[PDB]
Design a protein around this ligand. Structure first.
Ligand code: TW3
Ligand code: TW3
Ligand code: BTI
Ligand code: BTI
Lengths: 541, 90, 541
C-alpha cells in the first residue's frame, strides 16, 4: 500500500525580486559561456586536420560514436574540458580523446575513442589520465569497454610524464587485463594505424575488429623500425587487416569500412550474453514539482550569499518528495531519503558550516544508508569547517574524522556534486575525489581550494612575521603586501572550475538545468554492479 | 480508392486514380476506345517528392526506432532508466 | 535495442545437380533402413512374451511411458540400438531397458523402465551400461529419476561382466544414493516382481509406489531362498504390496494397477516442489531459413567428398543467423555464435584437417565461451589431424594438446554431434566421449575409428617389415597381404554407426532432418543445472 499523502518540499521563488533577476542573469551568462566553449571544443582538432581525416575515407570520432550507440539514445560524455589551456602553447581539445557512457544493443557500455585530428592521436599526459579515469569508472560499475583505437602512441616530448610511473600508460594495459579477468568485456576496433603502444590494445582485447586498409597494427612503425633495426617496409605490409587476419591471428573480425566495423561491434555486444539485474526497490518515476531553470535565480554566481539546499533537492528529486532525517539536530547539514527516476537515494547536503552535531548526524545517516544498501548523493556547498578553542575542546576534528571514516568505508554507490565552495577538510568529509565516488560533477559557479586566498595569505604573513620576530629581524608592511598579493592571485586562478576541469579532477561541468537528468543516467550506470556489504573501521566514540 | 491501400503487392491503384482524376472522366463522355488513346497519360513516372514528404518519412523512421526501443524496455527490468528514452540527449 | 539487420548464412542448393540427386538417394536409403530397424526394435522382446505379459494384466513398458509423461509431450529416448547384434545368438532389443527424458507434471525427468519381455527383465552387461549412462546424464543435468522396476536381477551366465567391477551393477545403487544426497528426487515404481538386486532399488528410493498383486519386493526369490536356505514360500507372501505396506514399511504408496501407479507418480512429481530457473539470456525463437531435408543432398553418404559445415549450421540455427569468429584464420575450423530455440550457443565445427592455427582458434573460442557462460556445440567431420616434419617442428601436437586441455577443462554444457568421420586424436580434440559431453549423437553416415583401415594396415606392414629386416628374415608380399586384409575388414566392421551404437558409445543415431529438434530438447535438459565457473590448467604457450 503506497497511497498515503505525503507533504512535498519546495517553495515558489519571487520572480519579481531584484536578487532573483541578478542571480538569473549571472548564471545565464555563465551557462552561455560554458556552452560556447563546449561548442568550440566539439569543433575538434582543426579544419585542415578534419579535411585530411575525411580525405582518407574515415569517420570523425563523434560520428563514429553517434553511429555506434543505439538510435536516439542519450550519450553521457565525461571530461569534455580535459586539456583546456593546460599546456602553454598547445591546444588539445577534449584531451585528444572522447570518453563516455552510452547504450549499445540495450547494454550500458563505456566508449573510449581516440581523436586522430589532435596531434595525430598522440597521447598527452592528460589523455592518459582521462583514459585511466574512464577505465576506472568502467571497472567500478562493471561496464563493457569499447576502444575505437586511432592513435600515434605516446607523445615523445612529454614522455617523462607518460611512460614510466604507476598511473602512466602501462596502467591502461594493466586495467585491460584485470577487467578481462573479471568477465568484463573488452572490444577493440582498430579504425586507423597504431604506431606503437596502441598496437597492444587490440592484442589484449577479448575481440578485435579492424578496417581493411585503414587499421594497421604493428609493434613498431616503419619510422621506428628504420630507427631501431634499419629495415624498410611499408605500413600496409607491416600491419594491414589482410596480413593480420590471414596468418597473424591478431585480428578477429575483418571490416570493409567504419560503418561495417560499427555494425560488427554492435553484433558482438549483442552476442555478449549479458542481462542487467537490479538489487534495489523500484517505484514509478515522477517529475519534480518545480522548473529546473529557477535554480539559476536561486543559486546565482556569487558565493558570498547563501541559499537553502532544500530548493535544489525539491528541484531534482521525484515529485519533490523528501523525508528529512534529524531535521532540527545539526541544522547546517540536510540529510534525507528521496527517489530519482525510481531509484532510492540518500541525499546529504551542506547548508552552512560543519559543526560537531552535523558530523554526528552525517555519520549516523551514512551508517543507515550503508545498512539499507541505498546509493548516496552528496551536495557540496562548503563555507568552511568550524574551528575554535571550544570546538577543539569538544573534538570538532574528531567528529570530522568520524564523518570522514564513515564516508570512506562506505560501499554503496556514491555520487558527489559540487554546487558551491569546497574548501579544507570539509571537501574530504563530503566525499571528494580522494574517497572514490562513482561520479563527480561541478556547477559552473563552484570554487575548490585548500582554503580561501585571503586566509592563506594571512597565515603565511603571520608565520613570516613570527619567524622574523623570533630571529630578531624587522618585517615591513611592503613585505606583507609582496607576500600576500601573489598568493591571492594564484588562489583566485587555481579555484576556477575550468582550471579544475582541465586537469581530471571531476567528470565535467554540467548545466544546472540538466542536473537531474545527468544524475539519473549516472545512477543507472552505477546500478550495473551488485552492492556489497559494508565493513567499517573503529568508530572513535 | 484513396482509403484502399495495398502493401506488399504491385497493384493498378495508380492507374485507377489517374483514370478517375483525368478531367475527361469528370466530363462524363466515356468511349469504348478512350483508354487506348489516353494510355500513356495515366501511365506516367513518379514526380520528385517534396521535402515535406522526406521529412515525414524520416520522422516515421525515428518513431519506429523509438517504438522498438520502448518494446525492448518493456521486456527489460529497469523500466524507468533514462537510457531507455529516445531523447538523443547530449 | 535488437532491431539491427543482420546477414544470414546459407545458400540454395542446386536441386538439379546429379551429385545432389545421388547424395539425396543414398541418405534417404540410410534413413529408411534406420527407421525400419528402429521399428523392429520397438516391436519388443517377442510376440509370445508380449502375450504372456498382457495376460498378467500389466502394461507394456512403452505404454507405461506414454501414460506417464504429460499428454502430447515429446519424448527423447536414448540409446535405442543398445545390444543390436552385440551378442552372437541372443537378441536383446533396446538392451532390455528403455531410458529417456520426458516431461512429467511440467518437470523434465529421466525415465528408466525395465522391459520384462526381454529375458524376463534380466540385466545384460549392456543393460547395466545403459542404465549407468542414463543415471550419469540425470546426475549431470540435475533431473529427477523415475525407475519403472520390473526386472529379474542380473543375468547369471554373464555374471562376471555384471556384478564385480566399478562400472557394474553396484554403481547403480551408488549413483542412486549420491543423487539422493544432492536433493535429486528418486521415485521407484515397482510394476512387477523383482527377484534380487532390483529389490534394493525401491529400498534406496526416496518414495515408492507398488502395484497390489503384480509388484513384489524380496531380497531373494523363492528359488533363491530354496537354493540358499531351503525355506519354501510363495512369491506373494514373500513380497506383495499388502505384506510390504502393512508391516514392512518398504512401500510408501499402494496402487491398484499400472494406471493408478502412474497417476500416483505424477502426483508425487507435482509434490516435488521444484521450479526451473534459467541463468542465460533468452530471445524469441525463429525457424531456420532453409528446409532440413536438403541436408540429405548436401551431406550424402560418401565420406570421400567434402561439404561446407556452414550449410548444416544455417540449416539448424535460428533464422540462419551466425556470427563467425576469426573467419579467415584457421579456415579449416568454423567457430561462431548462434541461437537455438532462443538459447545462445557457441558452434565449433570441422571443415578440413586440423592445423596449428585451427587449434589456437578453437582454444581462444572455448576460452571466450567459458568466460561468457555459453553452451558449446561441436560438429565432428574429421578427415584427420595434420602431421608432418614441419608441423612437428611447429608443435602441431602441442596445439592439439592446447585444444584438448581447453575442451576438457570446460564447465559449460557441451553437446557433440558426429556428422562425418571421427579419427585419431581429433576425436579427443573435438569433445569425444572421454571428455564428458552432456549428449553425443551421430548421423547414420558417420565413421569412428582410431584411424583408417588402410593406414593401420600400412603401419603394421611397415613395422613387421622393419623388424624382419633388423632380424635378418625375409618378409614376403603374401605375408603383407595376409597382414593387411584382416585389418582392413576389421576396421571396416568396427567403424559402422550401428557397431558403435550397439555398445553405449553415444546416445543414439538421429535422422538429420530431426537434428535441430533433438538439439533443442537436449539443450533444454542441459539447462536445469546451474552453470559453474571454469578453472583452467596450465596453458602451455
Ligand atoms: C611504448 C608505448 C606505450 C608507446 C610508444 O612507443 S609511442 C612511439 C612513437 N610514436 C610513433 O612512432 C608514431 C609515429 N606517428 C606516425 O607514424 C604517423 O604520423 C601517424 C600514425 C601518427 C599518422 O600521422 P597523421 O596522418 O595523423 O599525420 P601527422 O602530420 O604526422 O599528424 C600530426 C603530426 O604528428 C606530430 N607528432 C607529435 N608527436 C607525435 C607522436 N607522439 N606520435 C605521432 N605524431 C606525433 C605532430 O607534431 C604533427 O603535426 P604538427 O604538430 O606539426 O601540426
Ligand atoms: C545381487 C544382484 C545385484 C542381483 C542378483 O542376485 S540376480 C539373482 C538371480 N535372479 C533371480 O533369482 C531371478 C529369477 N527369475 C524369476 O524368478 C522369474 O523367472 C522372473 C521374476 C524373471 C519372472 O519370469 P517370467 O514370468 O518373465 O518368465 P520366464 O520364462 O522365467 O522369463 C524368461 C526366462 O528367464 C530365463 N532367465 C535367464 N536368465 C535369467 C535371469 N538372470 N533372471 C531371470 N530369468 C532368467 C530366460 O532364459 C527364460 O526364457 P528363455 O530364454 O528360456 O526363452
Ligand atoms: O574552508 C575554509 C575556511 C577557512 C579555513 C578553515 C580551515 S582549512 C584547515 C581546517 N580544516 C577544515 O576543514 N577547516 C579548517
Ligand atoms: O585420422 C586419420 C588420418 C590418418 C592418421 C593420423 C594420425 S592418428 C595418430 C595421430 N593423431 C592424430 O590426431 N592424427 C595422427
Amino acid at each position: 500500500y503506497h497511497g498515503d499523502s505525503v507533504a512535498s518540499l519546495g517553495t515558489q521563488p519571487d520572480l519579481g525580486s531584484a536578487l532573483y533577476q541578478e542571480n538569473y542573469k549571472q548564471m545565464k551568462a555563465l551557462v552561455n559561456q560554458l556552452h560556447e566553449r563546449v561548442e568550440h571544443i566539439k569543433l575538434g582538432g582543426g579544419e585542415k586536420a578534419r579535411a585530411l581525416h575525411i580525405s582518407r575515407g574515415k569517420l570523425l570520432p563523434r560520428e563514429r560514436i553517434d553511429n555506434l550507440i543505439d538510435p536516439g539514445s542519450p550519450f553521457l560524455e565525461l571530461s569534455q574540458f580535459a586539456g583546456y589551456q593546460l599546456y602553454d602553447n598547445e591546444e588539445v581539445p577534449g584531451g585528444g580523446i572522447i570518453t563516455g557512457i552510452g547504450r549499445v544493443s540495450g547494454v550500458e557500455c563505456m566508449i573510449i575513442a581516440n581523436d586522430a585530428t589532435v596531434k595525430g592521436g598522440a597521447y598527452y599526459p592528460v589523455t592518459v589520465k582521462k583514459q585511466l579515469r574512464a577505465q576506472e569508472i568502467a571497472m567500478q560499475n562493471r561496464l563493457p569497454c569499447i576502444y575505437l583505437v586511432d592513435s600515434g602512441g605516446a607523445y615523445l616530448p612529454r614522455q617523462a610524464d607518460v611512460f614510466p610511473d604507476r598511473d602512466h600508460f602501462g596502467r591502461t594495459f594493466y586495467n585491460q587485463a584485470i577487467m578481462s579477468s573479471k568477465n568484463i568485456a573488452q572490444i577493440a576496433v582498430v579504425m586507423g594505424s597504431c604506431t606503437a603502444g596502441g598496437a597492444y590494445v587490440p592484442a589484449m582485447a577479448d575481440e578485435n575488429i579492424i578496417v581493411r586498409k585503414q587499421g594497421t597494427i604493428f609493434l613498431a612503425g616503419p619510422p621506428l623500425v628504420k630507427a631501431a633495426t634499419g629495415e624498410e617496409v611499408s605500413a600496409e605490409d607491416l600491419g594491414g587487416a589482410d596480413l593480420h587476419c590471414r596468418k597473424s591471428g591478431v585480428s578477429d573480425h575483418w571490416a570493409l569500412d567504419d560503418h561495417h566495423a560499427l555494425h560488427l561491434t554492435r553484433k558482438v555486444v549483442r552476442n555478449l550474453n549479458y542481462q542487467k539485474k537490479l538489487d534495489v526497490t523500484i517505484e514509478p518515476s515522477e517529475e519534480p514539482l518545480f522548473p529546473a531553470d529557477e535554480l539559476y535565480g536561486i543559486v546565482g554566481a556569487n558565493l558570498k550569499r547563501s541559499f537553502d539546499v532544500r530548493e535544489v533537492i525539491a528541484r531534482i528529486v521525484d515529485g519533490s518528495r523528501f523525508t528529512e532525517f534529524k531535521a532540527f539536530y545539526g541544522d547546517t547539514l540536510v540529510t534525507g531519503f528521496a527517489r530519482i527516476f525510481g531509484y532510492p537515494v540518500g541525499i546529504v547536503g551542506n547548508n552552512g558550516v560543519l559543526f560537531s552535531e552535523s558530523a554526528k548526524k552525517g555519520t549516523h545517516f551514512v551508517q543507515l544508508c550503508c545498512q539499507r544498501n541505498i546509493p548516496l548523493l552528496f551536495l557540496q556547498n562548503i563555507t568552511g569547517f568550524m574551528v575554535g578553542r571550544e570546538y577543539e575542546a569538544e573534538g570538532i576534528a574528531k567528529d570530522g574524522a568520524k564523518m570522514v571514516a564513515a564516508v570512506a568505508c562506505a560501499q554503496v554507490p556514491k555520487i558527489t556534486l559540487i554546487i558551491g565552495g569546497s574548501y579544507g577538510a570539509g571537501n574530504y568529509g563530503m566525499c571528494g575525489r580522494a574517497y572514490s565516488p562513482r561520479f563527480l560533477y561541478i556547477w559552473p559557479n563552484a570554487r575548490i581550494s585548500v582554503m580561501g586566498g585571503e586566509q592563506a595569505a594571512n597565515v603565511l604573513a603571520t608565520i613570516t612575521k613570527d619567524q622574523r620576530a623570533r630571529e630578531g629581524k624587522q618585517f615591513s608592511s611592503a613585505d606583507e603586501a609582496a607576500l600576500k598579493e601573489p598568493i591571492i592571485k594564484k588562489f583566485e586562478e587555481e579555484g576556477n572550475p575550468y582550471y579544475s576541469s582541465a586537469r581530471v579532477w571531476d567528470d565535467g561541468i554540467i548545466d544546472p538545468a540538466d542536473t537531474r537528468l545527468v544524475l539519473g543516467l549516472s545512477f543507472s550506470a552505477a546500478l550495473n554492479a551488485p552492492i556489497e556489504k559494508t565493513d567499517f573501521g573503529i568508530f572513535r566514540m | 480508392l484513396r482509403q484502399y491501400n495495398i502493401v506488399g503487392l504491385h497493384t493498378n491503384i495508380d492507374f485507377l486514380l489517374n483514370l478517375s482524376g483525368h478531367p475527361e472522366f469528370e466530363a462524363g463522355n466515356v468511349h469504348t476506345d478512350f483508354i487506348p488513346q489516353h494510355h500513356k497519360q495515366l501511365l506516367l513516372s513518379r514526380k520528385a517528392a517534396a521535402k515535406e514528404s522526406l521529412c515525414q518519412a524520416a520522422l516515421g523512421l525515428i518513431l519506429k526506432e523509438k517504438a522498438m526501443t520502448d518494446t525492448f524496455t518493456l521486456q527489460a527490468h529497469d523500466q524507468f532508466s533514462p537510457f531507455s528514452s529516445s531523447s538523443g540527449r547530449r
